[PDB]
Amino acid sequence: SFSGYLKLTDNVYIKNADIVEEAKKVKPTVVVNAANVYLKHGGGVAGALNKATNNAMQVESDDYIATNGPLKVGGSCVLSGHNLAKHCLHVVGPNVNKGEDIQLLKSAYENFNQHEVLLAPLLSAGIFGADPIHSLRVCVDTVRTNVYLAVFDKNLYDKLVSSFL
Numbered sequence: 571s572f573s574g575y576l577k578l579t580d581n582v583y584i585k586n587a588d589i590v591e592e593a594k595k596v597k598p599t600v601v602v603n604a605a606n607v608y609l610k611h612g613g614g615v616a617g618a619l620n621k622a623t624n625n626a627m628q629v630e631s632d633d634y635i636a637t638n639g640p641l642k643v644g645g646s647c648v649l650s651g652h653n654l655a656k657h658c659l660h661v662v663g664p665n666v667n668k669g670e671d672i673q674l675l676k677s678a679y680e681n682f683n684q685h686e687v688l689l690a691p692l693l694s695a696g697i698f699g700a701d702p703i704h705s706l707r708v709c710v711d712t713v714r715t716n717v718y719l720a721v722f723d724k725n726l727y728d729k730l731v732s733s734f735l
């Protein structure tokens with residue numbers, strides 16, 4: 571299972587790791603995707619997770635959207651984890667680069683509470699434009715279940731650990 575994580579709180583752990591490599595190694599029950607409302611897995615974590623599934627995540631996601639329509643910002647859906655995990659929890663954090671309300675980041679993290687353990691990225695961080703330090707703070711203050719955060723960028727991982735209150 572999960573190895574090499576730094577414990578931040580009772581239930582939040584963090585590691586400088588590529589979430590795709592981490593998912594292939596652990597095969598967790600749940601891997602969180604940093605999804606958008608259309609489940610178009612183009613870039614960032616979504617593009618990387620989808621490419622690791624050989625586009626099977628995108629094919630499944632297009633069928634989900636055809637049936638259900640788009641997700642809400644702050645919402646989620648559970649789909650297959652493919653070769654990476656049992657399930658993928660596609661969570662939509664607000665995209666600050668699209669002017670979405672950063673207050674929706676807490677609602678996005680609340681989706682994690684429906685799963686006893688998750689491998690996840692920092693929601694709304696990276697190409698979503700939010701401050702990752704704020705994302706980590708909202709994560710620790712919102713998620714009560716066991717979350718193993720994979721931070722791809724070493725420099726950001728170091729900054730997140732060194733500034734963690």
Ligand SMILES: O=C(O)[C@@H]1CCC[C@@H]1c1ccsc1
Nearest residue numbers: 614615691695696721722723
């Ligand atoms: O973790 C990072 O370094 C950033 C911030 C949030 C997710 C993003 C990422 C993760 C896997 S590819 C890009």
